[model samples]
Target: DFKFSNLLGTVYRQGNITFSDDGKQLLSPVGNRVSVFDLINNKSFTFEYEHRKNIAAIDLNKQGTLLISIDEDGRAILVNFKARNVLHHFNFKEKCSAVKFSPDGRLFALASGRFLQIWKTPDVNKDRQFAPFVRHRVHAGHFQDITSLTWSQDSRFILTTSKDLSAKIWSVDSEEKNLAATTFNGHRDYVMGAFFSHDQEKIYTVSKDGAVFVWEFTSWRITKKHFFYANQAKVKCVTFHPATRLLAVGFTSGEFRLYDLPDFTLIQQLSMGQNPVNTVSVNQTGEWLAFGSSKLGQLLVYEWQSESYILKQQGHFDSTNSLAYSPDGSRVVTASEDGKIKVWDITSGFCLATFEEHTSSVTAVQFAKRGQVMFSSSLDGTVRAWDLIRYRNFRTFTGTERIQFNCLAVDPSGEVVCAGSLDNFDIHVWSVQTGQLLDALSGHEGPVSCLSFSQENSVLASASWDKTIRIWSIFGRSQQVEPIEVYSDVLALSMRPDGKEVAVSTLKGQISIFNIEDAKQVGNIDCRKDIISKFFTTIHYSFDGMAIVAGGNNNSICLYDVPNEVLLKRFIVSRNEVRVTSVQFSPTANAFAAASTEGLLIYSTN
Candidate 1:
């Protein structure tokens, strides 16, 4: 009954990026898998074929029929690009930093140590398979490790750039007697890229020292050396569109500039972010430019003539702390430890929006009951209400004293919001429309750890480390408060959909269900043996309240049947280094979202 539906929020990790020959699609590495962004449809999806480790290089054939992705360990996967299936796997037995496919789609090149290797492309149309990779040729001469590989327009020659501060041109066939290997060696820094002109008469070599050396193919000597004017940042990536005679350069300062070839006139200059640009590529038509930043997991595609962004996205740079599903279950909002919040579309697997107003880590996020409004509490001593329609922070709530809020909740009417303080024992309330502080409920003896509002009533439930759960009828005529004592410190709180009962998770690794009207503990589910004994950081009841899901400082998300009082299933997050920080059941679907270091994972009962 349980199935993992999707992983959303990550785009470009640390690796090479490529564009489809037609310029409608982009492919970038996200951990071990490759994520594709369909520019025309405004959608994104991750390919199922994954490498054994993080991808270090990726390349797509000019025809867009085949893909080659190499992991950091030099393991490679040959994938059928159209059908999204893996065709073969190979290991180079060493770390590879560069991979490139020939324009004719007949062969590919890779940088293995100081050597450049060419391998024949696997024939997908064949009825049987052999080794699949027939070695075409191996050329070596570079003194240091190879950095990048570029194929000639005719696929008869290749350009190899190396850390030895030189770029070399080698013929694909040894029988070619007219052309010998040509080396260009004017740059003082590591060479990053070498590109050939459309006519094959000129060669351009870029180095990390911000030098672009133009060489005459026949003379095998440098003609003109140009440098970026007034720019002190070193160049990190470079690409050229031979047909349009354009050169694109990316720098460590996150800035990218385009220049017209031969004339070396600056065409456009823009910045992606503060992180260094790791990769740059242009489509065949020279209309679309793509750039990737490894530090922020960001990807950007821009159209130079239009002066607009085709796609700009960045995943959370740190672990995701919390997430909440939208009222209609079409989207989910995530808050991360890096003080960033992102809204992701469920069906498209794309991050619709990102927020960075919070100065510190965001602890929790919750969506309103019926609208495109959401609330979030941050350690920056503020609570914010956002209107998704306009993508703006419409309201901000703060306590009389500056105290970091640890948890947040919204009322069913979407008019009131509450946040629990991590330093103060009080719960601060605010009016959404007026943007005014309402009142503070100060009864907990210790810092409030969690908060929740019943769906059917205005009653609020708050849990604290003081070993007590308090139920407050804030909007009632009598201002009545009920307290249920627990044997251990409370960490999380959840209310049933009908407002009849509430569940509290404690430091003793136990989930105790309490009846709201009776004000007594009704049932208990012991989780001491299943979890790490650090307590569940979050717990939530299913839509019908027949089941509950809990996860904490552990990789396992446990689901328990309420009436049966038995554990139904344990969903293990494959990425064990990241603990589950938050889990929430979708209000409109039989699915749940778990936030962790690996972004947001959507699970459904299928």
Candidate 2:
């Protein structure tokens, strides 16, 4: 039930990435969780860990048999990959910064403060009662805390860079306790990253002072310190592709340069934007380059051969509040607290367009029956319509007084649109073609939470926090209103495609389904046991009317069987102070999309 199909956002920039045994997948940290993205399958799965502190670093073994996750508070977890279980958890009482697994999969090393520790890998075939960690080694000498750690390809040595302006190498089985076989120096500022060239003959180190030093054993020299003829912005990160013998240098100015191996010849120089580059990595074959930015929460994987982006995502700077799938289900538009609207292509998972006419947070967005038009309501006291054919905002509707629009609804023929306001407790109706405010329907005494029109009828259903659901007939001669009372406060509601049943998510964390034919209770799902948050932010029914998906503050998305009143699937979308704002099933029933505090998530069976 809880599975990940794919992850579209970078969602990680604070640490390095780990390539699986065959280099088919990558393991990276996202807050307190670790997500595994499969390059071959183009799918992903997230492993949730309830760490109290943020994850500082995570590394998977070269054999893909083990995983070591370290948090900022010096807590470490050893996870068994095959069993998908926690082998052990321990506290070093330190401020951990780096973790690295040996290339041979025999051991792993962690850098906490100024100490570097190495422990033997656990053998799952051994006795469970015995302590799995057998061998232990500790190296110390660096004055400042360790910043980065990388293991030798032969698994005989470890290289560590630190803020003390130096990089040190430690032998695994040295007779002298000094352990540090050699120390490389001459860095003027904090070291950003360092690595050994393919032959393990030369060492490369980059520092914040824009100095890139080349060191070799016997008589290692600072052969190069590359700040010459460049912007004043300091270097922030470095990555090397051994197969192609190319090195990437990223800077605070958001620019990156690629240089050839020993000659240091400039191959490619490109700018990613204005923010600093937080992390950089290259794929196994040296075909793609990955870059991440923390300030904008941006992630991009660029194909160097084609000079195109293989994947790119820049999510809302603030939390997302709502999302709507297009009528054809090939596109999805998201509304966020940052007052921006982003339309995404389903297959490519890239943003197609952005709308920023709203001055305040956009509360809701809905697509017309024909998918040619879109409507969004915002707190800026306006309801706007966007023409999908031309991708422009052509109409704006507003009522008297400045009101915060909270919900949106569109008629079947795309003739009329309605938006509910939080401050006025009124629904404003407008003509899509004329952009004129038709009428203000006022009845509910509380703030409106959701508004939807029946697919096959003229009835519009509006749910409010006042523990009532109202059905209004706008085209009828009487224009009468029918109110249905429920047990708890109505948080969100959705009408089935056929327009027979309306499901309302309540503050009690339950969804009560009612038949519109008689306005009587039909069924309900008591989801209180599965959710800790007592409310659901969004509720969406499947296209065939067989399933309902709900998402909210529990860092999970739940899909239920509507006819049987049972939960069929439960997906944990994220961890550590995350929430899913919206979820929708594609019109074609081929995919599922979710918009959350982190970013966008796409799921498909294939």
Candidate 3:
């Protein structure tokens, strides 16, 4: 009953980005998937076709009806953009550094190693054909790998940049024998981008050393040169808009600048973050400037004329460490090793807000059962409560001494919060309203790996690497805690929705069930043959308590039928090497969220 419903965050990964002709849509690559943002509607979604490897380049035709995404290995997928469906799949048998749709939309270009290839653009409404790509022509001249390929407004001439410190102009048609390739070779560093001016009488070549050369197209000579402030940082990417004579440039210093062409007057400047910007683009109207940082998975769309951000989003800079959905099932929260927490809207498929109070890796996060508040534990030695309404840290709980907390839990009434530390081997319980540490319960000999609170009672279950699971009656008259011995080191624990039983997954690849009422071992499932484990594994039960979803260092998310003792389904979230640190089912819906290197994947039964 589970299926992939959506993917949120990860605005951009690899550098290929573009805006539709109307500037109402933005397209970018995310891991092996391609995502499109509907600017006018404030919604985002990824295409269904997944590439064999991370997508390296993407382009949309002038009509905005067709899309082409190429992977690093040159495997490409042609898609009907408006319909959001795959039309054809093909491969180029080499690494492709760039893929661009010509202005006329009849031909597309690919930068394959030192060669430039022109292919006929496939018709969007055409039926399945044996070969969707028909090679129009191929030109080879660059000494090193081509960095980018840009088309002239007329679609007759193409400008190509390369790491060999030069940009070349080539004729798209083979019959133009008189128009031999003209090479611009003044730059002292790797060329990043090259573009033609409005009248085709001038050209601009951006180099890594922060040099911008203004060349006379007819004379093939540099007429003027520009540099970053004192030439301190390299120019990483550049985009030029001919109609408006505006140039957008992203630098290695995480800064991006917009300048009025010809005069080279600085129009505006801004920084995406502390990470270098990997790509930059200007929308069709030359009003919106898009910038991306592959290092941080950040994307920003700025309206230069109005001085406003139309869109600003960043995904987990590192691997996701934990995930939890809101009580209303309309939002999901994710914590990351990069020391940031982000809340995402389920329906809009975009990040709502982000909190960066934690200075170290965030270990766990959970939503309160009854309210609009959530708590997170971090290795930075604090458990902080956040108000989702105001999107601020309202409370911070800390132990007597600095220690790393690895797991977290909240009482059903949302009155008390507890965190288990890996270094101290103790569970620290704090009053949520008062923000004071109430008690530190100690017992296990090793790190506390996971924790769970009973939904139907005040009982809290704690699992540890010491090969034991402790059931503590946090609110009962008797403060006695029972420690149950397990077969191996317990990695994760989850209490049933009814609070009658609990399930724990161990390092030895076993899921052990326990009857909480008597503290008796009910049953166990041998998952050794079913999964390959290397690191921490997270396990959680479905809302109805009939099934469990488990995932971790392996690439598979396994769903088990609890009463039948059989595997219901196995979900492979990515083809790349990914570590799934957390997985949980929605409390009110037939859906679950998995946090991994690929961002947060939302799977639903619909």
For this target, which candidate reaches the highest lDDT against the unseen true structure? 1
- lDDT tens per residue, model 2, 149-260: 8777888887888889988888874444655777778678888777888898888887888777788666676665565246678887787766588888788898988886
Model 3 C-alpha lDDT versus the unseen true structure: 0.82
lDDT of each: 0.83, 0.76, 0.82
Ranking by lDDT: 1, 3, 2
Query: Candidate 2 — what's its lDDT?
Result: 0.76
Q: After superposition, how far is residue 428 of candidate 3 from its true place, in Å?
A: 6.9
Report the number of clashing residue pairs per model. Answer: 0, 0, 0
Instruction: Predict model 1's lDDT versus the native.
Output: 0.83
The true-structure Cα RMSD of candidate 3 reads 5.1
For residue 497, what is the lDDT in candidate 3? 74
For model 2, state the Cα shift of residue 243 in Å.
5.0
lDDT per residue as tens, model 3, 96-212: 988988888888999999888888745566756466577767787888999998898888889999998889888886564433278888688899989888888888888888878
Which of 2 and 3 is ahead in TM-score? 3
Alpha carbon deviation, residue 66, candidate 2 (Å): 5.8
TM-score winner among the candidates?
3
